[PDB]
């Protein structure tokens, strides 16, 4: 697998899976979120303040489903 690493732009949607995130900072970009198991989980979309990055592909950021279809 690979890391997404997408750097969030100010104002861009970010996705936190409440069921799977290890800590509050664990986030997915829209593309990864919708290609992941988390699309059907309890989640929160928050608009980014800019900076940070998508954590898709980080096995320590997710209790389940660390990769999406693109990055696995
Ligand atoms: Zn991503
Ligand atoms: Zn991904
Ligand atoms: Zn989840």
UniProtKB/Swiss-Prot annotation:
Highest taxon, organism lineage: Eukaryota
Which tissues and organs express this gene's product?
A: Broadly expressed, with highest levels in skeletal muscle, kidney and pancreas. Present in acinar cells of the pancreas (at protein level).
Instruction: Give the residues the record marks as binding a peptide.
Output: 53, 55, 58
Q: At which positions is Zn(2+) 1 bound?
A: 4, 29, 32, 54
* Cross-link Glycyl lysine isopeptide (Lys-Gly) (interchain with G-Cter in ubiquitin) per UniProt, renumbered positions: 63, 70
Q: Where in the cell is it found?
A: Nucleus; Chromosome
Q: What does the entry list as the binding residues for Zn(2+) 3?
A: 32, 56, 68, 71
Q: Identify the residues that bind Zn(2+) 2.
A: 17, 20, 38, 41
The zinc fingers classed as UBR-type run over 3-72
> Anything noted about its domains?
The RING-H2 zinc finger is an atypical RING finger with a His ligand in place of the fourth Cys of the classical motif. The UBR-type zinc finger forms a pocket that mediates recognition of type 1 N-degrons. It exhibits preference for arginine in the first position, and a lower preference for lysine and histidine. It binds N-degrons with a methylated arginine or lysine in the first position.
Q: How does it assemble?
A: Interacts with UBE2B; promotes the UBE2B-H2A interaction and the ubiquitination of histone H2A by UBE2B and UBR2. Interacts with RECQL4. Interacts with TEX19; does not lead to TEX19 degradation and stabilizes it. Interacts with CASP8. Interacts with ATXN3. Interacts with UBE2O.
Q: What does this protein do?
A: E3 ubiquitin-protein ligase which is a component of the N-end rule pathway. Recognizes and binds to proteins bearing specific N-terminal residues (N-degrons) that are destabilizing according to the N-end rule, leading to their ubiquitination and subsequent degradation. Recognizes both type-1 and type-2 N-degrons, containing positively charged amino acids (Arg, Lys and His) and bulky and hydrophobic amino acids, respectively. Does not ubiquitinate proteins that are acetylated at the N-terminus. In contrast, it strongly binds methylated N-degrons.
The family assignment reads: Belongs to the E3 ubiquitin-protein ligase UBR1-like family.
What protein am I looking at? E3 ubiquitin-protein ligase UBR2
Q: What is the lineage of its organism?
A: Eukaryota, Metazoa, Chordata, Craniata, Vertebrata
Task: Name the gene that codes for it.
Answer: UBR2
């Amino acid at each position: 697998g690979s890391l997404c690493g997408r750097v969030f732009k100010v104002g861009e949607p970010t996705y936190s899976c409440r069921d799977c995130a290890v800590d509050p900072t664990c986030l997915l970009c829209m593309e990864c979120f919708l290609g992941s198991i988390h699309r059907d989980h309890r989640y929160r979309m928050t608009t980014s303040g800019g900076g940070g990055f998508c954590d898709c592909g980080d096995t320590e950021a997710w209790k389940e489903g660390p990769y999406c279809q693109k990055h696995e």
